[PDB]
């Protein structure tokens, strides 16, 4: 078992990149995107559809839009006289380069994500969201600026991880902005406690937050931030009493009321 070591092994089974290979792959991806848009202009079809069919042909039969239409469009692309099959070639090469770049940079995602444990998401969920951010960064990277890929990719990986944490960490979903409000309130209260030598009051937290903040608003914000408890929480030393055994039902009418 232990899927973390399994994934780490699969990750380390791919060699890292040097500057030459990384810049070569990024350039190949950029030229592939340019070739894709040129091909779309030549054939008159949508860039998205042509990108999808080219990616399907690159990934092959292993990855399961249907074979009929993709084969039709792939043959229509083979109908180009010359100087356009070249664009098709650069498109395919750029897609292969995109795949290779993502695979090679998968380790930075793990290195970043190992610092966000213990915040309501498991390690592998954090890794997968970081992978999504990495794919975004590969999509948006620009090698002309002579910047190392990790420099640009770290921002997108962090954005993906934080958005995932704010979106999927609570049983009751809270909007992103108000999650940031809760986190800011917690940080403010913690620093106030550190300075005061005791737990602050709602008035002091309101004053420290700034304008537009009073004790009632702080109370409401702390009220909504409560997480639900488990109906299966054990009660007592023995494993025979749970929490939900003490909670009556108020919806269904009682026999007295029905009579």
């Amino acid at each position: 078992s232990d899927p973390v070591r399994q994934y780490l092994h699969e990750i380390g089974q791919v060699p890292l990149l040097t500057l030459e290979e990384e810049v070569e792959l990024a350039r190949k991806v950029e030229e592939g995107m340019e070739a894709i848009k040129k091909l779309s202009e030549i054939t008159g079809l949508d860039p998205d559809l042509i990108r999808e069919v080219v990616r399907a042909k690159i990934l092959g039969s292993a990855r399961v839009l249907d074979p009929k239409t993709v084969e039709e469009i792939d043959q229509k692309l083979k109908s180009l006289p010359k100087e356009h099959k070249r664009y098709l070639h650069i498109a395919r090469e750029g897609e292969a380069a995109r795949q290779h770049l993502i695979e090679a940079n998968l380790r930075l995602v793990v290195s970043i994500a190992k610092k966000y444990t213990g915040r309501g998401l498991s390690f592998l969920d954090l890794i997968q969201e970081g992978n999504q951010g990495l794919i975004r960064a590969v999509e948006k990277f620009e090698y002309k600026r002579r910047f190392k890929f990790s420099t640009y990719a770290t921002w997108w990986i962090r954005q993906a991880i934080n958005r995932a944490i704010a979106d999927q960490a609570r049983t009751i979903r809270i909007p992103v902005h108000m999650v940031e409000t809760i986190n800011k309130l917690s940080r403010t209260a913690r620093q106030l406690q550190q300075e005061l030598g005791r737990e602050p009051t709602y008035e002091e937290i309101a004053e420290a937050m700034g304008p537009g903040w009073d004790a009632k608003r702080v109370e409401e914000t702390l009220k909504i931030a409560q997480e639900p408890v488990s109906l299966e929480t054990p009660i007592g030393d023995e494993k025979d009493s749970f929490y939900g055994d003490f909670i009556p039902d108020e919806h269904l009418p009682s026999p007295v009321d029905a009579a």
Binding site: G244, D245, F246, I247, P248, D249, L252, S254, P255, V256
Partner: protein, 48 residues
């Protein structure tokens, strides 16, 4: 002597002073009865 008849118990009886305590187990706190009442959420069975 028997208090109901005034006659003596037929044999001598051991009598003396003993130290006796009252325990926290009182029948006032334990007697419980129910006809109908609250029911649980999932099973719809009476609570305990």
């Amino acid at each position: 002597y028997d208090g109901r008849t005034g006659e003596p118990i037929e044999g001598p009886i051991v009598v003396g002073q003993m130290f006796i305590m009252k325990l926290y187990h009182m029948v006032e706190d334990k007697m419980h009865a129910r006809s109908t009442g609250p029911y649980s959420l999932i099973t719809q069975q009476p609570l305990g």
